Design a protein around this ligand. Sequence first.
Ligand SMILES: [K+]
Ligand SMILES: [K+]
Ligand SMILES: [K+]
Ligand SMILES: [K+]
Ligand SMILES: [K+]
Ligand SMILES: [K+]
Ligand SMILES: [K+]
Ligand SMILES: [K+]
Ligand SMILES: [K+]
Ligand SMILES: [K+]
Ligand SMILES: [K+]
Ligand SMILES: [K+]
Ligand SMILES: [K+]
Ligand SMILES: [K+]
Ligand SMILES: [K+]
Ligand SMILES: [K+]
Ligand SMILES: [K+]
Ligand SMILES: [Mg+2]
Ligand SMILES: [Mg+2]
Ligand SMILES: [Mg+2]
Ligand SMILES: [Mg+2]
Ligand SMILES: [Mg+2]
Ligand SMILES: [Mg+2]
Ligand SMILES: [Mg+2]
Ligand SMILES: [Mg+2]
Ligand SMILES: [Zn+2]
Lengths: 129, 101, 204
Amino acid sequence: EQRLNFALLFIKATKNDTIIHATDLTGAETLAKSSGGSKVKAHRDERDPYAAMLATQDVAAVLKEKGYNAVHIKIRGKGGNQSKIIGPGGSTVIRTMMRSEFKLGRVEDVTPVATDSTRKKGGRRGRRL
Amino acid sequence: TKKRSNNGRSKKNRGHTRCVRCEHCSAMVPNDKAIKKFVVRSVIDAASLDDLKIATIYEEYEVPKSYYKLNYCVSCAVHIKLVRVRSRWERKIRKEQRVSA
Amino acid sequence: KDSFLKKEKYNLRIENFPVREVGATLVNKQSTVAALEKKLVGRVFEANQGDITTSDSANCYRKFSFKIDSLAGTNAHAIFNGMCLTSEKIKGMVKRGLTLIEGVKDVVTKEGITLRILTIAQSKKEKNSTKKTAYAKTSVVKEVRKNIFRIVDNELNGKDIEQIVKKLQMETVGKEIEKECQKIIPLQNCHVLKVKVVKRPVKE
RNA sequence: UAAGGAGCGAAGGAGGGCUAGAUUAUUGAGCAGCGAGAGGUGAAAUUUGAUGACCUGCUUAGGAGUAACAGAGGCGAAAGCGCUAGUCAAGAACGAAUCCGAUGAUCAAGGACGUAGGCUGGAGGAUCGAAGACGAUUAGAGACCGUAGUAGUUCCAGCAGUAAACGAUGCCUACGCUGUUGUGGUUAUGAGCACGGCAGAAGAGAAAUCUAGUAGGGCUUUGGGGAGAGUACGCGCGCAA
Ligand SMILES: [K+]
Ligand SMILES: [K+]
Ligand SMILES: [K+]
Ligand SMILES: [K+]
Ligand SMILES: [K+]
Ligand SMILES: [K+]
Ligand SMILES: [K+]
Ligand SMILES: [K+]
Ligand SMILES: [K+]
Ligand SMILES: [K+]
Ligand SMILES: [K+]
Ligand SMILES: [K+]
Ligand SMILES: [K+]
Ligand SMILES: [K+]
Ligand SMILES: [K+]
Ligand SMILES: [K+]
Ligand SMILES: [K+]
Ligand SMILES: [Mg+2]
Ligand SMILES: [Mg+2]
Ligand SMILES: [Mg+2]
Ligand SMILES: [Mg+2]
Ligand SMILES: [Mg+2]
Ligand SMILES: [Mg+2]
Ligand SMILES: [Mg+2]
Ligand SMILES: [Mg+2]
Ligand SMILES: [Zn+2]
């Protein structure tokens, strides 16, 4: 019946935390925002698939209030000269949005890769543990 | 005593090579010596493809993949168990490993 | 104090494609048309070719970018601002045992806009042949690259943007390259990789 | 001359100097949206945020670097060399009925180059980070880990002269088994020439293994049980180290 009213959803997924943030198609207006660390207590759980899932539900609720129906997803890790694998939690944000009623448009990996780069932290020997 | 004929590295007929940084600890390692690993991972997990089939707006959809080459120093490769210690006759066997997902 | 209540939606419109209207954007309500211009003009968005055309599901690998230019009532009108291939396509294309050929060139439209174009091609391994790799010799790569630049100059230099956009849609430059350069060596995956707007002329 | 140097023809290479451009990325500022946490770890604290962080837009300013392709691949006397065009000298190899005719090998003294870190003067200053300062852990940590931070790290003109500067195997020149796989030319398309990798064999060696097989070919360097000692005195170079 109804047309598909679309929003953008950005997802950042590092080793330490996950950040979820909905915007208009222009990226220049913000509709809702949450993080894993907002909902959980212990610092070691901010990357947890569970904390990501709790934080996604709050964002899904506010979007349903503002009257949105469909979503495009752009997802990333940290990149630059650092790690460029998508962290834990990133792939549970997406599955949660699908259990909520939302129709999924398109998914894209938008991690910032460098053609060559500045020097990384850690010294010539690296972390010793 | 000399443990390996190739000194543990792939350099021949050269003076010097570019360095790269270890994924796990950021140590510098020469490119011709570093342990290398290839990854091709779907953006969406296998446990969600059955929901994707009812969530998508398109008639059919192909999931996007993500591609990586990772580098490791000797200590990290041994500790993460990418490689293992082997007997004096096994050391000589060379075979290509699988691409991970 | 629910600020969200106090916002005005406007519809985004585009040209030289089969689909005219693509979505809508918010702003806080304002008294003066001069303010609304200064708030909306300068914004940007991107759209996949598969969304703004009726087409084979294969053509999803390309994105187009548009910059807001003008306001009329409910509608914001937006103009061409570049083209880009999707990350999955770029990363999936590169393979071991083959050579990449790459180029950068600058061109000028009749309208006066200056554009910068990035181009890619890959070598191909012939059939009935048993060597493991099909690398291209360094001097031969310079022959291909020299040819690519005259093809881009012939196709796009001194044209209108209405003409350029349809050439990009139909992928004519890739097709021409594969035809023309086959005499030098066999090639595959010939594509325009990125188009970037460098200078726009001071106009009223 | 399957000794050397000069020259001709077609071609190949991250070899070197210079000129003019480039896609991203990391920081810093401006402005806009949002309204509570971000960072970091095995687990945490220093620390930063309502003077609006984080994240998402648009603008800009700089200084480094050339990912993936990329290899038991290529080039260089070694140290070393990876974006694109244009320009300037010289060299290696190959093809062949070109020219001169012993012009040659190795080398005390003497001369030129030499990663990095260091020093003298100028330019500049993104990222990283000796010293120094904190937060934790410990009997104690001055260390390892985290926050922060300076000299240096870049460029031009020079000094210095050391490295596990290693394939730990001097340079010319010989005689020598097989199979396989590369790179660049040439081809009666059968093969060759230069530079490599790999796997056996036979000999060799205390073995491990083989740049180590055979041998009164030529020339230089160099060792003679551990320690004290690459130290004392004298001398030569260096601004000092
Ligand atoms: K954490
Ligand atoms: K928290
Ligand atoms: K809390
Ligand atoms: K060396
Ligand atoms: K190795
Ligand atoms: K040059
Ligand atoms: K130096
Ligand atoms: K200290
Ligand atoms: K203490
Ligand atoms: K420290
Ligand atoms: K730092
Ligand atoms: K010198
Ligand atoms: K000297
Ligand atoms: K020495
Ligand atoms: K050689
Ligand atoms: K011996
Ligand atoms: K002395
Ligand atoms: Mg350890
Ligand atoms: Mg031992
Ligand atoms: Mg702000
Ligand atoms: Mg490159
Ligand atoms: Mg010559
Ligand atoms: Mg220095
Ligand atoms: Mg000698
Ligand atoms: Mg003695
Ligand atoms: Zn490591």
